[PDB]
Design a protein that fits this description.
This is part of a larger assembly, with one copy of chain A (160 residues), three copies of chain B and one copy of chain C (58 residues). Chain A is mainly alpha-helical and 160 residues long. Chain A is built from seven helices and no strands. Classes of the chains: A mainly alpha (160), B mainly alpha (126), C mainly alpha (58). Chain C: This is Pre-mRNA-splicing factor SNT309.
């Protein structure tokens, strides 16, 4: 039973098992309007389970042979990947510099933050304030004592 | 606030001028009378060497304290950038190898779609 | 000159007000409010962790 | 010239001996206090391992304006830090979309090989 | 050759309000001290 669980978890999905989406049949309909793109779209909707689930009889030995075969088909290869990675990095820095529709989403993201954060701030503040306004008065009324302990000091030194 | 020899709150603090540390006068005096030395560093010290103006001060609170605060802000935010510079160099490195395996594989999808259809085109005609 | 005239130089009264559906200018001003509010909420976390112990020690 | 943590010009630089890299004393110490490691090579390093290793003063120009400069520079750095983090999340996000297509494609090859295998049997008959 | 200051609960203000007050308090004191 331990062996069977080891076979199902590994052969469940490569992306899902490793690490990190909303359901969109209209996005799959819009993207098609080419065949390989539709195959990955249905694959994403199946694993995730306006969303219907269905595909559950497709996804270990057939995948290993498929991976070994594709590896055979694939210094010079290392430089062509480093050059393309720099080109995509320049395209990512260019798409970011132009922005700084889209502006309304960021403001609403802040309104969530402003809400979530400032509510936390006000709770952290009022919790602190209750404990620390007393200690502020304690600390601040002590500071006033230095200002009188100093002013007398000088008059005594002067008179001395 | 503490005396380094005893560990008590010293009621007559006198700071030495060889190993800079606040000692209690009555304690350090006896240490000097035992042997002319500073207890911490064992450097020579006499009783006259030990020491108990006009500008008025105010307590250390949240200009200089404000400037050292802004160092903490920026020095912490500079490490925040490393967390995203280092993590970017892993993602882009995995993306580069991922897109290369995608580009190396899709040529084989294009040939199998040719070969499986060519085998259907060949066989059905016969 | 500041003391004689009795006038302090004006600081950035901008972050507090802002406005939604603005432009590229308020897109920046909005993104400013987020990062500083996250810094704020992180700046309140390390205070509350110690809490009153750090205050009473001073 | 540049400490490889912040991007500043270091005013008390210190070099790590596990990996040849001149860091700044303040920043390397915080990292070691978090976890005993080197930020670049992830090798086991300590504070005593560090060996303490140009200063040209900025003369801005010919004070109330300098207040608003420092305001603008913090205002700019806050956005230059923000822009660089949303880009990291979306490059990882677009990377995850590639991984699904990568593994989805190699399942579609298995069916295509079956159609080729079925064809090779029929051709022989 | 340690001191603790408890950074206020409402700690924007450090850039705007706190820093402004510090250079006001430095300015109007030394001017008043020059008067003295």
């Amino acid at each position: 039973d331990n062996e069977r669980s080891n076979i199902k978890s590994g052969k469940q999905l490569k992306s899902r098992i490793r690490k990190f989406f909303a359901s969109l049949p209209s996005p799959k309909n819009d993207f098609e309007i080419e065949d390989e793109k539709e195959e990955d779209a249905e694959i994403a909707e199946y694993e995730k389970e306006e969303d219907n689930f269905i595909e559950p009889p497709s996804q270990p030995r057939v995948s290993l042979v498929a991976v070994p075969l594709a590896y055979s088909t694939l210094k010079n290869n290392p430089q062509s990947a480093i050059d393309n990675k720099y080109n995509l990095l320049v395209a990512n820095a260019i798409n970011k510099e132009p922005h700084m529709e889209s502006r309304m989403q960021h403001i609403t993201q802040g309104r969530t933050s402003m809400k979530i954060q400032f509510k936390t701030a006000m709770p952290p503040t009022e919790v602190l304030l209750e404990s620390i306004q007393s200690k502020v008065e304690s600390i601040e009324q002590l500071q006033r004592k230095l200002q009188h302990v100093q002013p007398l000091e000088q008059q005594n030194n002067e008179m001395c | 606030m503490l005396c380094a020899i005893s560990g008590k709150v010293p009621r007559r603090p006198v700071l030495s001028p060889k190993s800079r540390t606040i000692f209690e006068k009555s304690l350090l005096e006896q240490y000097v009378k035992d042997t002319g030395n500073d207890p911490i560093t064992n450097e020579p010290l006499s009783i006259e060497e030990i020491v108990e103006s006009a500008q008025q001060a105010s307590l250390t609170e949240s200009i200089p304290n404000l400037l050292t605060s802004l160092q903490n802000e920026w020095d912490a935010i500079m490490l925040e950038n490393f967390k995203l510079r280092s993590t970017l160099d892993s993602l882009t490195k995995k993306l580069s190898t991922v897109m290369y395996e995608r580009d190396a594989a899709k040529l084989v999808a294009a040939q199998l779609l040719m070969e499986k259809n060519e085998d259907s085109k060949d066989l059905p005609k016969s | 000159a500041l003391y004689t005239e009795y006038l302090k130089q004006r600081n950035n009264k901008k972050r507090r007000t802002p406005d939604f559906n603005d432009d590229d200018d308020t897109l920046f001003l909005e993104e400013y409010r987020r990062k500083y509010p996250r810094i704020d909420t992180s700046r309140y976390i390390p205070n509350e962790s110690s809490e009153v112990s750090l205050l009473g020690i001073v």
